[PDB]
Amino acid sequence: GKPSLGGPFHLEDMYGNEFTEKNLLGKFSIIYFGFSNCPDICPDELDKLGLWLNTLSSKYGITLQPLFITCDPARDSPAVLKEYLSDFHPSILGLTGTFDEVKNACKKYRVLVDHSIFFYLMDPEGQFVDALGRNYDEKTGVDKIVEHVKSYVPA
């Protein structure tokens, strides 16, 4: 029904560990594509995500796997992502890689500033279940995620 987003990808997290689509299995993940040198948009989105994560865990006991994937592999090295993310929620994990690896990941999710606007929610089976745009605020975004997590049932 929804666009066939997602698929195999191979990246590295900001600590150097391999991270592929296989790491999405067994949990609800929320992915955001952006870049450290993005003005306004990306900082604002990551701030909103931090609010969501804290509300989710404290009020509903829900823990997501938040991932920040860079679209600028030229400058966003693991060290740059670690420093950039130090100003945001600690659970957010930055992912990067070679131009080819990043290009593929972006292609799989059909994804610079004007288009770094959706959060992609992936279920425990690694399937795309919903995208949260800027029209979701600190409260309605949480409501939508809770709905998906609590109603989830495996294959």
Main sheet?
Answer: 7 strands, mixed
CATH topology assignment:
Glutaredoxin
Q: CATH superfamily assignment?
A: Glutaredoxin
Q: Order of SSEs, N→C?
A: EEEHEHEHEEH
Give helix % range. 25-40%
Q: What is the general shape? A: globular
Task: Give the termini separation.
Answer: 17 Å
Strand order of the largest sheet: 2-1-5-4-3-6-7
Task: Estimate the strand proportion.
Answer: 15-25%
State the domain count. Answer: 1
Textual characterization of the structure:
This protein is α/β, with parallel strands linked by helices and 155 residues long. It has a single domain, classed as Glutaredoxin, CATH 3.40.30.10. It has 4 helices and 7 strands. The chain has helices spanning 41-60, 78-85, 99-108, 140-151; strands at residues 10-13, 18-20, 29-34, 65-70, 93-96, 119-122, 128-132. A 7-stranded mixed β-sheet has the order 2-1-5-4-3-6-7. α1 packs across α4 (140-151). The radius of gyration is 14 Å and the shape is globular. Belongs to the SCO1/2 family. It comes from Saccharomyces cerevisiae (strain ATCC 204508 / S288c). One of its GO terms (cellular component) is mitochondrion.
Topology of helices and strands:
Layout: E1 10-13, E2 18-20, E3 29-34, H1 41-60, E4 65-70, H2 78-85, E5 93-96, H3 99-108, E6 119-122, E7 128-132, H4 140-151
Parallel strand pairs: 3-4, 4-5
Antiparallel strand pairs: 1-2, 1-5, 3-6, 6-7
Helix pairs in contact: 1-4
GO molecular function: copper chaperone activity; copper ion binding
Keywords: Copper, Membrane, Metal-binding, Mitochondrion, Mitochondrion inner membrane, Transit peptide, Transmembrane, Transmembrane helix
Subcellular location: Mitochondrion inner membrane
